[model samples]
Target: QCYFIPNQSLKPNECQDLKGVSHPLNSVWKTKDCEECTCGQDAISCCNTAAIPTGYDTNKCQKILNKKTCTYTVVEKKDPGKTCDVTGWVL
Candidate 1:
């Protein structure tokens, strides 16, 4: 899942490592959809590792909207301009 650090203090590589991780942690107690829709997309990490990549790649995590198709992306990170939907559950 993608994380939005408004002021990222880490280097470029560090940011890559920080990507694709689940928030509220990967603990079993935590539900995958940690946060509800931010502008119609599920939590940033909700659909990670499926159709999208596990990390911060815009191509994998960016928001794409197509209402006629009835499928779309979510918005967790505001600055990056990506969107995702809670289509399935995480393992």
Candidate 2:
């Protein structure tokens, strides 16, 4: 995904974000939305870095997002106290 930045400045070669935050051009950073991003000439491009759990028993298992760390956890649907075994994940 890409976030188009406006009013790009060449003096410092930086990108100003929607929140009025500036990032140095050609620099890399991570956003609060969990995206690994890069500041380019005119935009901030990002890639999803979070992994999704898969290859588990879906009937009794469910995937839930952990808000604190932006990670996914597979847990038992009936009893959330327990977690299911995860075979693999895709980033």
Candidate 3:
């Protein structure tokens, strides 16, 4: 199966072939780059190195990331009237 790693800087659909390989139950595979990922018997999932801003009233914020630059940002979750309001994004 081809599993895509999400929110990566370089290749978003970069994947490994797991058609014939055998893995122990609950075994996890990891990436060598700045992304953190895991591959199990069923699927593969990943998250990048970016993080949410700290020391702020961000409980009402939604954490998000850029697909191309792999930067993290936050949007006000409680206020729907805002237009893509983002903060603490690392370029």
Candidate 4:
């Protein structure tokens, strides 16, 4: 999911941090892709905020992602009303 920010007479290390945000150096922002980013003087970097559940009962559980809040859940495959006992998670 990328957007274009009009590039005109931009400075070095200045980048468009997802979406059409014309970000400048030394500023911080969050992206719709659930990431925290910084338009720093040296580089543009991002820190993602998702903890994906893993090592669970994959055969009986379902992994769900809610785009509205950028969160994921591990639940029973047969019922959406329940949560699964997730054993591990990774970021």
Candidate 5:
């Protein structure tokens, strides 16, 4: 099963395990370093990047997402902090 993390910045390659075991690989870059985060607050479509048909009101989404701290993690994993890109999948 594949689960998505709220914020994901992994690149194509560049993952390793210190324990020497196989697991979900994540390659990422800090979004804060790239640029400031701005999207309709949790409108879903706002961050979707590939919304079709157009006309998705992200105001509410952005409102919700923004109101919540960027540190807000999905379910599992660790919360890095604010400024992390909110996209990425878990395996």
Candidate 6:
């Protein structure tokens, strides 16, 4: 999976090594239905779209509303914009 800083780009060349570095709390990870979720380093990490912050595309977010079994894919550093054609699922 891809890894990078929060609210940034996915240029792996520009990212630092994540080894031993814990994910920050204020960072947002791309989830299913294009839901943006926050990082929880101390506790855990996953594709629980329910953890995504409100105020985004609620309709798209609802696509995975009934999903009980979740799985996370690549973690992006930013929104990647709705116009960008990124392929992946959150749950």
Candidate that would win on TM-score: 2
Q: What is the lDDT of residue 89 in candidate 1?
A: 35
Q: How do all models score by TM-score?
A: 0.17, 0.70, 0.33, 0.61, 0.14, 0.20
Better model by TM-score, 1 or 5?
A: 1
Candidate 2: C-alpha RMSD after superposition: 3.3
For residues 1-85, what per-residue lDDT tens digits would candidate 3 score against the true structure?
2234332222233334334333333345443334655644334564555554543345676665566665555556776444344
Global Cα lDDT for candidate 6: 0.35
Candidate 4, 1-91: lDDT as tens digits: 2333333325665765335455776666776668666665434666766778786677888888777888888888876799888777777
| Candidate whose lDDT is highest | 2
Candidate 3 local accuracy as lDDT? 0.46
lDDT agreement with native, every candidate:
0.34, 0.75, 0.46, 0.67, 0.25, 0.35
Q: Candidate 2, residues 1-91: lDDT per residue as tens digits?
A: 3445443455347776667777777888777668776777766676777788898779999999887888889889987999898888987
Model 1: per-residue Cα lDDT over 1-91, one tens digit each: 4443331223322221123433232222222433221211222222223242234444444554444443345565554454444554333
Clashes of 4: 0
- TM-score, cand. 6 vs. native: 0.20
Per-candidate count of clashing residue pairs (backbone under 3 Å): 10, 0, 0, 0, 15, 1
Q: For model 3, state the Cα shift of residue 81 in Å.
A: 7.2
Give candidate 5's TM-score. 0.14
* Runs of candidate 5 exceeding 4 Å displacement: 1-27, 33-63, 71-91
Cand. 5 Cα-lDDT: 0.25
- Per-residue error for 66 in candidate 3, Å, reads 2.5
lDDT (tens digit, per residue) of candidate 5 on 1-91: 1123322323222222223222223322223212122322221011232212222223322211222333322221233242223344221
Candidates arranged by lDDT, highest first = 2, 4, 3, 6, 1, 5
